[PDB]
Design an enzyme around this catalytic site. Sequence first.
Site, PDB file in Angstrom:
ATOM      1  N   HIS A  40       0.811  -1.214   0.000  1.00  0.00           N
ATOM      2  CA  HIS A  40       0.000   0.000   0.000  1.00  0.00           C
ATOM      3  C   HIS A  40       0.850   1.273   0.000  1.00  0.00           C
ATOM      4  O   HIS A  40       0.267   2.369  -0.231  1.00  0.00           O
ATOM      5  CB  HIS A  40      -1.044  -0.016   1.112  1.00  0.00           C
ATOM      6  CG  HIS A  40      -0.534   0.464   2.454  1.00  0.00           C
ATOM      7  ND1 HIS A  40      -0.162  -0.381   3.491  1.00  0.00           N
ATOM      8  CD2 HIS A  40      -0.451   1.718   2.946  1.00  0.00           C
ATOM      9  CE1 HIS A  40       0.175   0.378   4.549  1.00  0.00           C
ATOM     10  NE2 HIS A  40      -0.045   1.671   4.252  1.00  0.00           N
ATOM     11  N   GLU A  52      19.472   7.321   7.730  1.00  0.00           N
ATOM     12  CA  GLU A  52      18.759   8.504   8.185  1.00  0.00           C
ATOM     13  C   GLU A  52      18.542   8.488   9.705  1.00  0.00           C
ATOM     14  O   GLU A  52      18.170   7.460  10.306  1.00  0.00           O
ATOM     15  CB  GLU A  52      17.377   8.616   7.527  1.00  0.00           C
ATOM     16  CG  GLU A  52      17.455   9.113   6.088  1.00  0.00           C
ATOM     17  CD  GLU A  52      17.681  10.609   5.940  1.00  0.00           C
ATOM     18  OE1 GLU A  52      18.161  11.204   6.923  1.00  0.00           O
ATOM     19  OE2 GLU A  52      17.390  11.145   4.840  1.00  0.00           O
ATOM     20  N   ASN A  54      17.501  12.286  11.370  1.00  0.00           N
ATOM     21  CA  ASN A  54      16.685  13.444  11.057  1.00  0.00           C
ATOM     22  C   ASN A  54      16.439  13.476   9.555  1.00  0.00           C
ATOM     23  O   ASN A  54      17.365  13.718   8.795  1.00  0.00           O
ATOM     24  CB  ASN A  54      17.358  14.736  11.518  1.00  0.00           C
ATOM     25  CG  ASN A  54      16.399  15.904  11.492  1.00  0.00           C
ATOM     26  OD1 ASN A  54      15.614  16.020  10.561  1.00  0.00           O
ATOM     27  ND2 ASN A  54      16.299  16.658  12.580  1.00  0.00           N
ATOM     28  N   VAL A  57      17.394  17.002   7.839  1.00  0.00           N
ATOM     29  CA  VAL A  57      18.734  17.540   7.915  1.00  0.00           C
ATOM     30  C   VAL A  57      19.669  16.500   7.328  1.00  0.00           C
ATOM     31  O   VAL A  57      19.649  15.355   7.780  1.00  0.00           O
ATOM     32  CB  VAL A  57      19.127  17.883   9.377  1.00  0.00           C
ATOM     33  CG1 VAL A  57      20.538  18.480   9.447  1.00  0.00           C
ATOM     34  CG2 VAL A  57      18.125  18.819  10.063  1.00  0.00           C
ATOM     35  N   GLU A  62      24.006   9.523   5.450  1.00  0.00           N
ATOM     36  CA  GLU A  62      22.942   9.061   4.563  1.00  0.00           C
ATOM     37  C   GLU A  62      23.508   8.463   3.265  1.00  0.00           C
ATOM     38  O   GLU A  62      24.535   8.909   2.731  1.00  0.00           O
ATOM     39  CB  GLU A  62      22.084  10.234   4.144  1.00  0.00           C
ATOM     40  CG  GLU A  62      21.383  10.910   5.322  1.00  0.00           C
ATOM     41  CD  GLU A  62      22.038  12.108   5.977  1.00  0.00           C
ATOM     42  OE1 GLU A  62      23.244  12.244   5.748  1.00  0.00           O
ATOM     43  OE2 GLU A  62      21.324  12.830   6.741  1.00  0.00           O
ATOM     44  N   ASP A  84       0.022  -7.500   1.980  1.00  0.00           N
ATOM     45  CA  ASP A  84       0.505  -6.117   1.940  1.00  0.00           C
ATOM     46  C   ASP A  84       2.031  -6.093   2.074  1.00  0.00           C
ATOM     47  O   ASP A  84       2.599  -5.801   3.136  1.00  0.00           O
ATOM     48  CB  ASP A  84      -0.182  -5.296   3.016  1.00  0.00           C
ATOM     49  CG  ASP A  84       0.089  -3.804   2.898  1.00  0.00           C
ATOM     50  OD1 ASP A  84       0.564  -3.440   1.848  1.00  0.00           O
ATOM     51  OD2 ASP A  84      -0.240  -3.052   3.854  1.00  0.00           O
ATOM     52  N   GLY A 175       2.321   7.006   8.205  1.00  0.00           N
ATOM     53  CA  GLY A 175       3.707   7.420   8.005  1.00  0.00           C
ATOM     54  C   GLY A 175       4.743   6.385   8.447  1.00  0.00           C
ATOM     55  O   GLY A 175       5.901   6.408   8.006  1.00  0.00           O
ATOM     56  N   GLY A 178       4.860   0.388   6.070  1.00  0.00           N
ATOM     57  CA  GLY A 178       5.954  -0.205   5.344  1.00  0.00           C
ATOM     58  C   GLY A 178       7.193  -0.509   6.189  1.00  0.00           C
ATOM     59  O   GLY A 178       8.075  -1.274   5.727  1.00  0.00           O
TER      60      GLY A 178
END
Length: 223
Positions: A40, A52, A54, A57, A62, A84, A175, A178
């Site tokens: 989804h 990651e 933040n 920033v 990263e 899913d 949010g 996944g």
Amino acid sequence: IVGGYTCGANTVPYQVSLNSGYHFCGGSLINSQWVVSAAHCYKSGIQVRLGEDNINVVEGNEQFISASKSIVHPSYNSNTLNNDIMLIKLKSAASLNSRVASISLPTSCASAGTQCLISGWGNTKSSGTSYPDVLKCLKAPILSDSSCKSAYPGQITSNMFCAGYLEGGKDSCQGDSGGPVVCSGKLQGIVSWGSGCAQKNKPGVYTKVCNYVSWIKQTIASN
Ligand SMILES: [Ca+2]
């Protein structure tokens, strides 16, 4: 994550952010070239962000790598959220280090009452709305199938399990979708759905990863 804690930078080194101009879903790094997420969460134009803390920033650890292919499970049903799960292949391999690391797939399914770690950048209130910039963490137990089915009658398949607290107050949320549920060092769940977040008698519902290991291995071996 509602009612969780700040993880600590790069203490969850398999956690990824999916970005389509903005963070929209989590995922888990399972080797240097593949990420597992929720079907989804499908979008065109995904960039995978690894290392990651933040998400607003650039802190220096990263890696930003574009997806080359997305593969939603063949039996995904967007109405029921059965199956899913989606794989995302990276255009180039990630560099694995102490801050960016893969999580193991399960060999056996996880047990009711096991405490798992759930993590993400999702909403931190109910329908209050507040999104964090740094990664949040939650410890939550796996609930029995009978309690899961009692909470969501007619809605739970054998490819789902519930985790969290029937009293409410602690849960994953929009949010966090996944992202990982890790139990005893193995990826056992994917944040999938729930009625609201952290509501009484409405625990989180997670994709049961141990039912998909054969599909994951065969797909990675062919793509
Ligand atoms: Ca960052």
